[PDB]
Design a protein around this ligand. Structure first.
Ligand SMILES: [Mg+2]
Length: 312
């Protein structure tokens, strides 16, 4: 009664809102279209445009479900509005629902306008995203399977060789990289290769050789590390450090010690039931000491000092 001609009031809000979509602030444009809808005039083309325009505002705002609903209401008035099918398709695409995106664009392509360029582009974009996700899936899943194949083959190898691995709370930073493998990583009968902490406790110095084959003997590893002239051994008894004059010792699972025989391989040492000589942090830990200082150093070995280096 205060004011009427609601069809022109609806077009007032419609034309007023279209200048704001050109102006780019969408939340104000969006609400201006809503008031044209609230008038509820008996006119199809006005209401169709209001629903299609508000859907466009919701797409720019990135409210994708609300965009689909305003497109649906526009298509109830005009089911051959190709603009609304593009927006439903793009909205579904952005929600990672590619089948719902393809269905809408396929309906527009097959049954409304095959020549429409925005619908064809959306088809090609849906097509690419479908198969790029496939290439991503069949890369992720093969690599997880390959990772798992390497891990089972390594555990089988270590269980077969009777190797116990006792982890410690404080490994020095060279060990924490973690380098243990098979030569043929799919054949668990090929050589297991592990790193080695070589301890010289009398001098307070250590070597870290990154890769030692299991079939390597104790003598051969001792020959390699002591070959060069030692700049390192400043403390007492430096002259005794030669392959002929040193002895090699290793920690047991109980916490004590065993003299590692120079003829023996690391394979045969780790495999033995008694005494059980394990790895520490997936690596060897040997103690090279002079032959003359071994008697005093073995007595010094504290059993609980070593027992409480361990994690659990
Ligand atoms: Mg053993």
């Amino acid at each position: 009664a205060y004011e009427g001609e609601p069809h022109e009031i609806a077009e007032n809000f419609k034309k007023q809102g279209n200048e704001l979509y050109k102006a780019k602030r969408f939340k104000d444009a969006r609400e201006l279209y809503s008031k044209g809808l609230a008038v509820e005039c008996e006119d199809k083309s006005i209401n169709e445009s209001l629903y299609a325009n508000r859907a466009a505002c919701e797409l720019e705002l990135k409210n994708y479900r609300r965009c689909i609903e305003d497109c649906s209401k526009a298509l109830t008035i005009n089911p051959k509005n190709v603009k609304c099918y593009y927006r439903t398709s793009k909205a579904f695409f952005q929600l990672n629902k590619l089948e719902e995106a393809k269905s809408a664009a396929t309906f527009a392509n097959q049954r409304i306008d095959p020549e429409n360029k925005s619908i064809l582009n959306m088809l090609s974009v849906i097509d690419r995203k479908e198969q790029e996700l496939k290439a991503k899936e069949e890369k992720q899943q093969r690599e997880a399977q390959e990772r798992e194949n390497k891990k089972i083959m390594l555990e089988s190898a270590m269980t077969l060789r009777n190797i116990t691995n006792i982890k410690t709370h404080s490994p020095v930073e060279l060990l924490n990289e973690g380098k243990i493998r098979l030569e043929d990583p799919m054949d668990f009968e090929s050589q297991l290769i592990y790193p080695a902490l070589i301890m010289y406790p009398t001098q307070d110095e250590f070597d870290f050789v990154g890769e030692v084959s299991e079939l390597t003997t104790v003598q051969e590893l001792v020959d390699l590390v002591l070959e060069g002239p030692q700049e390192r051994f400043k403390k007492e008894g430096k002259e005794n450090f030669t392959p002929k004059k040193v002895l090699v010792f290793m920690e047991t699972k109980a916490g004590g010690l065993i003299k590692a025989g120079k003829k023996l391989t690391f394979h045969d040492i780790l495999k033995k039931e008694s005494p059980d000589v394990p790895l520490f942090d997936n690596a060897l830990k040997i103690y090279i000491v002079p032959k003359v200082e071994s008697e005093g150093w073995i007595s010094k070995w504290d059993k609980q000092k070593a027992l409480e280096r361990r994690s659990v």
